[PDB]
């Protein structure tokens, strides 16, 4: 059972078959491939509506720009955080209205600002006086959001000057945004950011702006590996929002989650293409995706990946010190430096879960190695819910 829409095919899971079961079915040229569970994205959306009922999510497209993902999120009602002309074209090309887009790049090429003005995208961020000069010339009627620091972010000591400069240029400033990021292992950083945002809203009132938009950014975890759970963060954000930004004020609260929505939806299957033995003693395994491909996340996103075997465990099997390398002819294309694994063979598969964020979006075809095909799946109940 399958369905087609927005130039993608999606298999519908019927019994109690899960995305993991489909993966096994495909394994039962042997190029690496992904199984992407669109149902996991709807699950994440329901969980978001429950945890942060006052906060509208604007998906950060740069995390994973796969057409099916963006199509799915659009269908379920998210907004989009776009940072370039291409990202805006992607979202508008899927039928999403300009009002559901925030151009949340504080430092934008002037031609790309002109593109947003021409296509009706009015909401953009900024954090510098030169950005205001550019907006004055290229999108004078835009609705600006001041990005504050917790590369980017205006200090509280310098925000007042920017707000006065915006008023001098007759630019409307409608709110404040911040981005804590995923590195943070403390929910209190989000709380302090909300408090800093309220200070800036009050400064803006003194300058003559009646701000109404609070954007709490991204960094929410999308996988279970992370120590700090999503609901540990949201449970402390909610009281801060109620304290500093009561609903009676007319304020609109939004966020820019990326990895939250898509990290766990993608599982990557790679095949063991080559193998060396350094003396049964230690083993080196070469696989058909690597650091120039999906595992660029180890270098750009500081991600921590974990190799899982696809075959079922065996009683009392022996474990050996092993290393896992990518397919390129580059000595630094190494995925796992040292791990303990049973003896594996060429043609065997290894699985890498929680591979949806900052993976496919930044992969290249360096050395001619192609991108893994992505197979989409969705449970029957989730398929019905989306419609």
Ligand X SMILES: *Cc1c(COP(=O)(O)O)cnc(C)c1O
Residues in contact with a copy of itself by CB under 8 A are 29-31, 61-62, 65, 82-87, 90, 104-111, 127-131, 134, 151-152, 181, 271, 273-277, 284, 286, 288, 291-292, 296, 299-300, 325, 327-334, 346-347, 361-370
Check: CB of residue 146 under 8 Å from CB of residue 177: yes
Nearest distance, CB of residue 107 and a copy of itself, angstroms: 3
- Please state the closest distance from residue 86 (CB atom) to a copy of itself, in A: 3
Q: The tokens 């050996």 sit on which residue?
A: 320
Q: Known catalytic residue: 10?
A: no
Can you give the binding site for ligand X, defined by CB under 6 A? 60, 62-63, 81, 104, 179, 182, 217-220, 256-260, 329
User: Minimum CB separation from ligand X for residue 196, in Å?
Assistant: 16
Tokens coding 256? 């820019």
Q: Which of ligand X, a copy of itself, none binds 368 (CB below 5-8 Å, type-dependent)? A: a copy of itself
Contact of residue 366 among ligand X, a copy of itself, none (CB under 5-8 Å per partner type): a copy of itself
Q: Is 219 annotated as a binding residue?
A: yes
Choose between 177 and 379: whose C-beta lies nearer to ligand X.
177
Do 103 and 82 meet the contact criterion of CB atoms below 8 Å apart? yes
315 is in an annotated binding site: no
Catalogue the E-assigned strands of the chain: 2-5, 8-13, 33-37, 55-60, 79-82, 101-103, 123-126, 143-147, 172-177, 213-215, 252-255, 266-278, 282-287, 308-309, 319-325, 334-342, 349-352, 373-379
The residue written with tokens 């992969």 in the block is 363
By DSSP bridging, strand 282-287 and strand 266-278 are antiparallel
Residue 219 interacts with, from ligand X, a copy of itself, none (CB under 5-8 Å by kind): ligand X
Query: Considering CB distances under 5 to 8 angstroms, the limit depending on partner class, which of ligand X, a copy of itself, none binds residue 257?
Result: ligand X
Distances in whole angstroms, Cα of residue 243 to Cα of each of 133, 200, 249, 341, 362: 35, 15, 11, 51, 39
259 binds, among a copy of itself, ligand X, none (CB under 5 to 8 A by kind): ligand X
Q: Give first-to-last CA distance, the chain, whole Å.
A: 16
* 242 annotated as a binding-site residue: no
Query: Hunting for tokens 């300058």 — which residue is that?
Result: 207
Nearest Cα residue to 8 out of 96, 72, 68, 92? 68
Q: Is 292 known to sit in a ligand binding site?
A: no
Neighbouring C-beta atoms of residue 171, cutoff 10 Å:
21
Taking phi over 0 as left and psi of -120 to 50 as alpha, with beta for the rest, 231 belongs to alpha
- From the list 184, 199, 297, 329, the catalytic residue is 329
- Yes or no: say if 362 and 24 are a contact pair by the CB < 8 Å rule: no
Least distance to a copy of itself from the beta carbon of 162, Å?
A: 11
300 is in an annotated binding site: yes
256 is in an annotated binding site: yes
- d(CA 308, CA 268) in angstroms, rounded, equals 10
The H or E element containing residue 226 is: none
Minimum Å gap between C-beta 262 and ligand X is 9
Measured from the CB atom, the residue of 109 and 210 that comes closer to a copy of itself is: 109
Question: Known binder of ligand: residue 165?
Answer: no
CA angle 3, 4, 9 (to 5 degrees): 90
CB of 292 to ligand X, least distance (A): 12
Nearer to ligand X, 254 or 336 (CB): 254
CA distances 12 to 68, 266, 379, 384, 385, Å, are 14, 16, 5, 10, 13
Q: Which residue is nearest to ligand X (CB)?
A: 258
Nearer to a copy of itself by C-beta: 39 or 258?
258
Nearer to ligand X, 10 or 173 (CB): 173
Nearer to ligand X, 81 or 348 (CB): 81
Pick out the residues of the known binding site for pyridoxal 5'-phosphate.
Answer: 182, 219, 256-259, 358
Write out the binding residues for substrate. Answer: 300-301, 330
Which residues have a catalytic role annotated?
329
Which amino acids are annotated as binding site, given as ranges? 182, 219, 256-259, 300-301, 330, 358
């Amino acid at each position: 059972s399958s369905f087609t829409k927005d130039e993608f095919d999606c298999h519908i899971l019927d019994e109690g078959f899960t995305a993991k079961d489909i993966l096994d079915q495909k394994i039962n040229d042997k190029d690496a491939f992904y199984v992407a569970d669109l149902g996991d994205i709807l699950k994440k959306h329901l969980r978001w509506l429950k945890a942060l009922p006052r906060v509208t999510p604007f998906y950060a497209v740069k995390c994973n720009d796969s057409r099916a993902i963006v199509s799915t999120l659009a269908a379920i009602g998210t907004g989009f955080d776009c940072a370039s002309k291409t990202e805006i074209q992607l979202v508008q090309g899927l039928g999403v209205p300009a009002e559901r887009v925030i151009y949340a790049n504080p430092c934008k090429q002037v031609s790309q600002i002109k593109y947003a003005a021409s296509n009706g995208v009015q909401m953009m961020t900024f954090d510098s006086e030169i950005e205001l000069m550019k907006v004055a010339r290229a999108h004078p009627k835009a609705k600006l959001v001041l990005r504050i620091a917790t590369k980017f972010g205006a200090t509280l000591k310098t925000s007042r000057l920017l707000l006065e400069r915006a008023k001098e240029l007759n630019i409307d400033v409608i709110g404040v945004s911040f981005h804590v990021g995923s590195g943070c292992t403390d929910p209190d950083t989000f709380v302090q950011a909300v408090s800093d945002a309220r200070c800036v809203f009050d400064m803006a009132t003194e300058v003559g702006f009646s701000m109404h938009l609070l954007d709490i950014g991204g960094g929410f975890p999308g996988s279970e590996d992370t120590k700090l759970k999503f609901e540990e963060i949201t449970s402390v954000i909610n009281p801060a929002l109620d304290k500093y930004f009561p609903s009676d004020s007319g304020v609109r609260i939004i966020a820019e989650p990326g990895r939250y929505y898509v990290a766990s939806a993608f599982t990557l299957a790679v095949n063991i293409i080559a193998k060396k033995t350094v003396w049964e003693q230690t083993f080196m395994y070469y696989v058909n995706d690597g650091v120039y491909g999906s595992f660029n996340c180890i270098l750009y996103d500081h991600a921590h990946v974990k190799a899982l075997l696809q075959k079922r465990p065996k009683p009392d099997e022996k474990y050996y010190s092993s290393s896992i390398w990518g397919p390129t002819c580059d000595g630094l294309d190494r995925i796992v430096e040292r791990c303990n694994l049973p003896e594996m063979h060429v043609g065997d598969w290894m699985l890498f879960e929680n591979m949806g964020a900052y993976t496919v979006a930044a992969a290249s075809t360096f050395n001619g190695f192609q991108r893994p095909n992505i197979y989409y799946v969705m449970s029957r109940p989730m398929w019905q819910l989306m419609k």
